[PDB]
Design a protein around this ligand. Structure first.
Ligand SMILES: C=CCn1c(=O)c2cnc(Nc3ccc(N4CCN(C)CC4)c(F)c3)nc2n1-c1cccc(C(C)(C)O)n1
Ligand SMILES: [Cl-]
Length: 261
């Protein structure tokens, strides 16, 4: 087995209906990688389509400092394996959970740093005529150097041009995508990034549906318990503007005065 041959398992760092993720050291270079191991999906299925989006997204993207680097992908023994960069800080979701446990928080400055860094990742992805379509804390990963935020889980990535949309988490989904309007998909990533930052900011668990879900798509923010400048607030507000054309592009976002730097 190539997996056992090329790598030594150190620890399981993830599990679910996607299979498992392992922290592994590669014997040859002594470096650490996150390897996802999963049952090879049924030919022609959803998870196969989702899985191929991931492979063919790397084929295009290459390498960027705010996107989790992809090294290789293979299949064997009726499983598929994908070898990615290992980010020692876990995901933003883990960090948010840890913040509540020990009762710390991300300073307003650190919220802005998060927004800029992920924003840079998004600008790169969008420049390659791709959209991520599943931005949320659990898909943002952290490397501690003094910190790098990196976009991961490319399983929903689709083309801007000929988009094949597997809808992302309902909690971070812009209404126009739910309305099968795919004419401005980059702006959906922006919408989801705003709510991601609001989660980091200490806001309550986002609604999956119902009234409060709609109230957000009406362009109003969840309550943030920290003291954020009225202008950082206004940046986040316009990022969930009902009209996705009023939302800034990724490139407009990373050049914003509020975030420099
Ligand atoms: C290759 C699979 C995708 N993926 C990466 O590319 C990837 C890159 N880096 C890390 N770093 C990392 C993730 C999680 C912990 N843990 C915190 C919770 N526990 C306390 C244990 C440690 C940690 F320490 C480091 N993780 C990565 N991935 C990962 C891991 C788990 C689940 C998922 C899913 C649900 C598929 O998105 N992904
Ligand atoms: Cl657009």
């Amino acid at each position: 087995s190539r997996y056992t041959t090329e790598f030594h398992e150190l620890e399981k760092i993830g599990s679910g209906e996607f299979g498992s993720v392992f922290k592994c050291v590669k014997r040859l270079d002594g470096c650490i990688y996150a390897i996802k191991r999963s049952k090879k999906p049924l030919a022609g299925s959803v998870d196969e389509q989702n899985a191929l989006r991931e492979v063919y997204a790397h084929a295009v993207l290459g390498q960027h400092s705010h996107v989790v680097r992809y090294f290789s992908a293979w299949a064997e023994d009726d499983h598929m394996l994908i070898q990615n960069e290992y980010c020692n800080g876990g995901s933003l979701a883990d960090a948010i959970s840890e913040n509540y446990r020990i009762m710390s928080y991300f300073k307003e400055a650190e919220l802005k740093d998060l927004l800029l860094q992920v924003g840079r990742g998004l600008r790169y992805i969008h420049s390659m005529s791709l959209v991520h379509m599943d931005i949320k804390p659990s898909n943002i990963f952290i490397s501690r150097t003094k910190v790098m935020f990196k976009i991961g889980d490319l399983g929903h990535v689709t083309r801007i041009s000929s988009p094949q949309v597997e809808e992302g988490d309902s909690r971070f989904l812009a209404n126009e995508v739910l309305q099968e309007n795919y004419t401005h998909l980059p702006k959906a990533d922006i919408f989801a990034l705003a709510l991601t930052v609001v989660c980091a900011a200490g806001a309550e668990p986002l609604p999956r549906n119902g009234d409060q879900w709609h109230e957000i798509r009406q362009g109003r923010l969840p309550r943030i318990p920290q003291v954020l400048s009225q202008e950082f607030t206004e940046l986040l507000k316009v990022m969930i503007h009902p009209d996705p054309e009023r939302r800034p592009s990724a490139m407009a976002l990373v050049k914003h005065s509020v975030l420099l730097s």
